[PDB]
Amino acid sequence: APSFPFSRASGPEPPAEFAKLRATNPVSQVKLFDGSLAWLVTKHKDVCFVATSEKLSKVRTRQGFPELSASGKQAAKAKPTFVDMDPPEHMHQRSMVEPTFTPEAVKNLQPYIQRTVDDLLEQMKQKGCANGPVDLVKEFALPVPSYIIYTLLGVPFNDLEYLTQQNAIRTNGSSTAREASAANQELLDYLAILVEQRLVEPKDDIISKLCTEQVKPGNIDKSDAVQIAFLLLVAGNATMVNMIALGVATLAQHPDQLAQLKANPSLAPQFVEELCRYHTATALAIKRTAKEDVMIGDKLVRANEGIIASNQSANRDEEVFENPDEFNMNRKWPPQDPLGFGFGDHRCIAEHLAKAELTTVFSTLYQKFPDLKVAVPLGKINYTPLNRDVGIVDLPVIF
Numbered sequence: 062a063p064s065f066p067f068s069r070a071s072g073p074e075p076p077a078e079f080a081k082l083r084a085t086n087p088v089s090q091v092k093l094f095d096g097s098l099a100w101l102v103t104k105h106k107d108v109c110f111v112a113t114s115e116k117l118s119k120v121r122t123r124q125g126f127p128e129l130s131a132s133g134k135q136a137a138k139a140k141p142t143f144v145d146m147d148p149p150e151h152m153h154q155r156s157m158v159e160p161t162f163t164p165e166a167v168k169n170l171q172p173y174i175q176r177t178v179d180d181l182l183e184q185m186k187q188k189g190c191a192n193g194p195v196d197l198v199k200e201f202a203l204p205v206p207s208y209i210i211y212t213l214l215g216v217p218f219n220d221l222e223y224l225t226q227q228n229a230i231r232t233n234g235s236s237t238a239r240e241a242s243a244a245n246q247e248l249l250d251y252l253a254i255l256v257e258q259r260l261v262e263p264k265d266d267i268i269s270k271l272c273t274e275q276v277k278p279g280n281i282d283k284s285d286a287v288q289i290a291f292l293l294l295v296a297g298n299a300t301m302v303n304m305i306a307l308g309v310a311t312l313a314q315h316p317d318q319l320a321q322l323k324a325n326p327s328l329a330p331q332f333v334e335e336l337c338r339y340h341t342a343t344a345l346a347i348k349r350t351a352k353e354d355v356m357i358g359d360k361l362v363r364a365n366e367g368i369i370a371s372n373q374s375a376n377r378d379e380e381v382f383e384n385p386d387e388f389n390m391n392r393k394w395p396p397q398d399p400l401g402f403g404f405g406d407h408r409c410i411a412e413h414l415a416k417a418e419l420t421t422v423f424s425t426l427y428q429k430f431p432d433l434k435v436a437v438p439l440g441k442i443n444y445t446p447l448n449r450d451v452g453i454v455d456l457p458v459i460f
């Protein structure tokens with residue numbers, strides 16, 4: 062049994078193991094950091110099964126749960142939020158914050174998302190790059206998702222820049238364990254204050270709705286509100302930043318597609334669709350433990366055994382996506398859903414928001430800066446460590 066998680070084949074590539082497993086051993090056993098074994102599922106059909114099977118559980122206090130790191134094991138001892146719950150607890154809590162993320166709500170949010178992207182690009186423009194390249198991540202990829210989610214949660218304008226910086230430190234590879242920890246705790250402290258304030262005088266934001274609708278009636282605790290708001294903040298922010306950066310790098314690697322996007326920004330949606338399939342930046346979130354024996358493919362997963370369903374592998378499944386390792390914005394999509402945002406009940410709550418943010422970015426970035434260009438050779442791009450989810454640390458650009 063090979064150690065898991067696997068390391069990416071290279072900066073922008075997925076681990077090489079998946080393709081081989083998909084073809085010769087679709088459902089196999091892998092060894093986790095602590096020596097325990099878990100079932101790794103690599104085929105699209107099987108990943109979808111694992112994502113929806115009612116015989117599987119997300120509760121981390123169940124023995125056999127596939128925790129992939131030492132810290133993951135510690136985090137499992139805390140009170141869980143809906144991300145780690147099974148029905149009926151799962152939807153009872155998720156329903157408390159879903160309103161802001163429905164397709165209709167996100168469609169009505171389009172002007173705000175556009176306004177936010179326009180303002181950040183303009184700030185980038187007025188500043189220029191006369192003295193050299195600027196980091197596309199720091200100046201644009203980071204603040205876009207950050208400002209939007211913070212604002213949606215209820216954070217006031219003047220506090221955005223500081224909080225955006227602190228949340229980054231949380232996951233920055235350069236941060237020491239202490240720095241990452243301090244910033245993490247500091248965001249929780251700030252959220253605790255916001256809850257207290259909104260409990261007194263609510264505003265038109267997420268935290269206020271939790272206070273008024275759930276905390277006040279005693280449905281949930283104040284700390285619960287803080288944790289739910291915290292989950293919404295840290296669940297996909299770093300991912301959104303990485304996706305924007307990977308999107309720019311990808312367009313640079315395939316000039317003809319960039320030329321097409323520039324000529325027709327209406328292709329932004331399909332470009333985003335392919336980007337979320339090709340670059341599965343959150344590939345270790347579909348995990349479970351079997352509550353009872355369950356058959357998957359030619360294997361039997363016994364009760365109390367853990368399962369890791371790779372949506373990244375599923376998104377490169379030849380049986381579902383023709384020429385899967387080819388980035389093609391004009392891809393002819395099959396009836397099967399690409400799984401960049403998961404599947405089933407637990408499917409990313411912000412899928413519509415995330416796509417709207419990415420679609421807005423790629424339907425605007427090159428109109429603002431038609432000559433935007435990565436300021437370093439593409440083969441020198443600073444990607445996230447190979448033993449981590451795919452992403453980009455920084456991206457020097459000129460325009």
Ligand code: HEM
Nearest residue numbers: 144293296297301343346401402403404407408409411415
């Ligand atoms: C491009 C960006 C994003 C990607 C690729 C992404 C991907 C995912 C994936 C793969 C999962 C696992 C779903 C499953 O269990 O099947 C997930 C869960 C989740 N995501 Fe996202 N996400 C992104 C952005 C966001 C943002 C912006 C937020 C916050 C507003 C967010 C909040 C969540 C939450 C709360 C869950 C847990 C849902 C549940 O378990 O019920 N995501 N996301």
